[PDB]
From a paper:
CPS secretion is mediated by an ABC transporter containing KpsT and KpsM as its nucleotide-binding domain (NBD) and transmembrane domain, respectively. The transporter partners with the periplasmic and inner-membrane-anchored KpsE subunit, a class-3 polysaccharide co-polymerase (PCP), as well as with KpsD, which is assumed to form an outer-membrane pore. The KpsMT transporter is surrounded by a cage of eight KpsE subunits extending about 80 Å into the periplasm. Cryo-electron microscopy analyses of the KpsMT–KpsE complex in six different states reveal a KpsE-encaged ABC transporter, rigid-body conformational rearrangements of KpsMT during ATP hydrolysis and recognition of a glycolipid inside a membrane-exposed electropositive canyon.
In a nucleotide-free state, our cryo-EM analyses resolve two apo KpsMT conformations (Apo 1 and Apo 2). In the Apo 2 state, the NBDs are closer together and slightly shifted against each other. A similar arrangement has been observed in the crystal structure of the isolated Wzt NBD dimer of the O-antigen ABC transporter.
Author numbering:
A (entry chain A): 1 to 226
B (entry chain C), C (entry chain D): 14 to 269
D (entry chain F): 3 to 48, 72 to 176, 321 to 369
E (entry chain G): 47 to 49, 72 to 144
F (entry chain K): 340 to 370
G (entry chain L): 340 to 369
The structure:
Amino acid sequence: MIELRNLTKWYPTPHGRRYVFRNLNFRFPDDVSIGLIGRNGAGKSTLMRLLGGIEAPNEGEVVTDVSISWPVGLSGGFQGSLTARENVKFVCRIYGTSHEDMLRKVRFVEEFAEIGEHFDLPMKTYSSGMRSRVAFGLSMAFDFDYYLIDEAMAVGDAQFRAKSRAVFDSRVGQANMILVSHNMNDIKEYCDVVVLVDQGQATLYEDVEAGIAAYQGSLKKAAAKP
Amino acid sequence: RSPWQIQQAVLFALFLRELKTRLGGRWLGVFWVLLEPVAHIAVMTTLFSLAHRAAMPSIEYPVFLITGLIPFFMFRGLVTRLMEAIDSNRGLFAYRQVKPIDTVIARAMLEISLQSIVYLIALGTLGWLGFHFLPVRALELAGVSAVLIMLGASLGLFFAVVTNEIPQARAIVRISLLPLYFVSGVIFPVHTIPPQYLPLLQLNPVLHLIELSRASFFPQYRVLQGINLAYPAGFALLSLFLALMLYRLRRHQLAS
Amino acid sequence: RSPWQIQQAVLFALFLRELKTRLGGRWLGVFWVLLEPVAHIAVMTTLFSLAHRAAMPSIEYPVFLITGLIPFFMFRGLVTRLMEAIDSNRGLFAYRQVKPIDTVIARAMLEISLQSIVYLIALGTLGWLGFHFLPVRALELAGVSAVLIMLGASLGLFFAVVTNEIPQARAIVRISLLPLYFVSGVIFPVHTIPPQYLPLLQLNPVLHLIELSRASFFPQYRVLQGINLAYPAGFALLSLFLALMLYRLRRHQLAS
Amino acid sequence: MKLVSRLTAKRLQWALVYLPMLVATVYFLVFSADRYVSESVITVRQSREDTCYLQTYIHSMGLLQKLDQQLKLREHFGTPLRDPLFRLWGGTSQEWFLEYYRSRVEVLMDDICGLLTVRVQGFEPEFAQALNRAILEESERFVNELSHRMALKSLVVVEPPVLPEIAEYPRRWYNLATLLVVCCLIYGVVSLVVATIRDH
Amino acid sequence: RQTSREDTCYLQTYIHSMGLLQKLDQQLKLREHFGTPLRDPLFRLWGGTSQEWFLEYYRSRVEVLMDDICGLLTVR
Amino acid sequence: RRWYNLATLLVVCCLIYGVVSLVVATIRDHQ
Amino acid sequence: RRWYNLATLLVVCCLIYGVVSLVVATIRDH
């Protein structure tokens, strides 16, 4: 169960408060896959960050009784001067995971990353792909009830993308996923319900096709505005 | 999952995380942090030995200097590393159950443990040289040290919360700390300065704490009037209440 | 496109870049860079006025203290801001036609201009209070100031090149600068300290520079023996040659 | 490293908190012996050099031999068989006897008056007062003899030695409390250090 | 005063001395007077207390302050 | 003191030339 | 003092050698 109660989030600008959400109250459907769609700047990424706990709402709150993951593939939470083994160890201490569990978590991340000796080298020497790989491994290291993706399927090379797709296909049936993607084929394949974000309001569609049609109609209406 | 267990886990993670940054990667930060007191000891012993002999022929300079210098180092370290705690780990706030107060108190406990180690090492090497190291009254010394630690941590937390989104204030409080080295009378005994400027110097709580620590540490140490523990104790309690209240008021804005 | 022209353009750009960063975002940095000297003026005047009166009844404390404190502030600012120049703009070397030496000399000229402005303001406010401000021998004072500026910039560049890929050294040189405040004899006249420790204190070049600046600034100021300009001049020349040579050797490795 | 992780918590808890306090409580509440204190405050007048000589003379060896001849300190201090720490074991060396005596009598002098205070410990209050009185008499005779040997001066007793009613130095509760504080601090530091070495 | 600081600081030491306490207890019966308030158990002299505790109580009840710039003894 | 002065002036001139040449090379390194 | 003088001369020779080594590394850089 995920609920946004009185969620009001704004951005500080010199011309005033750029409000993104105003008194947003919305209940996510339970034990289903969610496709968060909307226009550019409508508020998909910030809502995903609010769900993942990266950014706290200015007003209201998010109430959840299930585990919500961080953006998968995000390298912003790392330390450049700290190596990957100590980084995933620190993330393990964040969630209070036991020593044996941390060991395998570390071994699993190291084996999935396929980086090598640079696994004992810090992120300030890493590239974008290396950071994406280690972030993806640290994301899969924990069994989350909900996994959040924002265009994380286009990272890495073809082999890494295929490995991630196979892993997530094996994961399907064990955990839920909130996906923010501009490609509606992925929404049709991976998501069971659709949540459209527009003008600070979230609308739920139990049918993926209906939500896609509604978003396309909203885009056409926006383009038709003179 | 009670809040206490996750709080303890994240505190331990932050503490060892800070320990890694503060100490050298080659495990050599202890060398510099032990060099810091001995240089001051050397320069003050070569600069004010005969002045202290003229001051009082009862307590030798090295122990009297250490027993005031190390608590002052603990205080300045607490203030300095506590005021910079929040604006050093902005990315780490991305994870849930992190908070800034956990970072500031992890830095506080790291500083406390490190300076306790330095104090124990200094007392050991002082007793190895034939000096006097055993405190005559250790309970009063422990209470005074606890009050000083609480005051330093409270001031550091207050400066961390208040001077958010203005680094420049952090630039000036440091220059306020330099005269406090001489105002507090840690180096030279305060019994020598004439009373004409005493009351203005009685408003420094760390002065009262240092004289009371010296009185509880040494046998037959004369403490002058108006060096009660009540004034620094009330200062520390009021500042801690104010800092906690200000942090509670500005909670989500500090996380950012 | 002559090398001097592009060098001047990038120096002006880098110069204003350092300016924006050093000065406040609300055009307020002049306030604190004027507040730093006056606090030390106040505390030293309230702490050592009668001591200076007992020292010599010829030169009043404010002008004598300013004329040594401002050059020392310029020297310490040059060293501190110069040694941190390379490891502050690591994202600036991505563009070509730029070098770390451009950043260090832009910071040097910014510090020189700021401290020259502060010195002129202090001299003006000193002459507005009825004191003596006009230098009796200004050419010798200018030469001494130039030597001190070159020595400070050279030491800062040397510490910038040498202590790359080890920030911990930058942690300890600050604690090497605090005793230098009292060793140099800027606050109190050096004529009072007994000669028993003079030969150890004559190895400080900034001491010689400060006494020579005071001698060239004041009429009938007695300079003690062994305060020749030759020793600090040779120190500055040798250090500048060594620093430029070390920069030239570690040129491509510095920028990364 | 195999035993480094084997210290766990309960072993460290036991061997660093509870066993030392068991032995401390057992010693203080049963094995300890009371040590009464007699306090005197004297000065020398016709002069900081003179009370300096006196302060050196109180802890000297010749005064110790004279007092041992007079009052038999070695026999008196060996009586408390229950206390093994603060008793004078028989057949011990002369140097240890001097160190023990110097520990038993504490000599202090204020710098702003020159008053010299002495506190003499003994296992019987009358013996402590007698030892303090003998110390004062021998000091007076010593300064008079030093004045006479050159070829005038007398001791001033601001406070004559008292006869104590109860002993004051073997404080058991205060020692237990400061042991609590020191033990807790030593636990905290060593547990933090064992945690960080184990995490490595 | 004669007809310095040494004699008045000797007095400062002597006011809290045990011999003066014995003389005052003989003269004025301090033990009997300081045990009269029974409703106050914190600032009363309990019966059958040790001589050391009696001396500490007397030192708490009599406060002696020294003015060094004037050399004046204030006894409260 | 002819020889001491000559040696000191030679060392000083060598250091000055080294500094000037290094500064000139650093200025030239802007292509 | 033969050994003290030899140690001092060794130290100053090592320092001189280091200085000329860095100088000759600098000039050799084209």
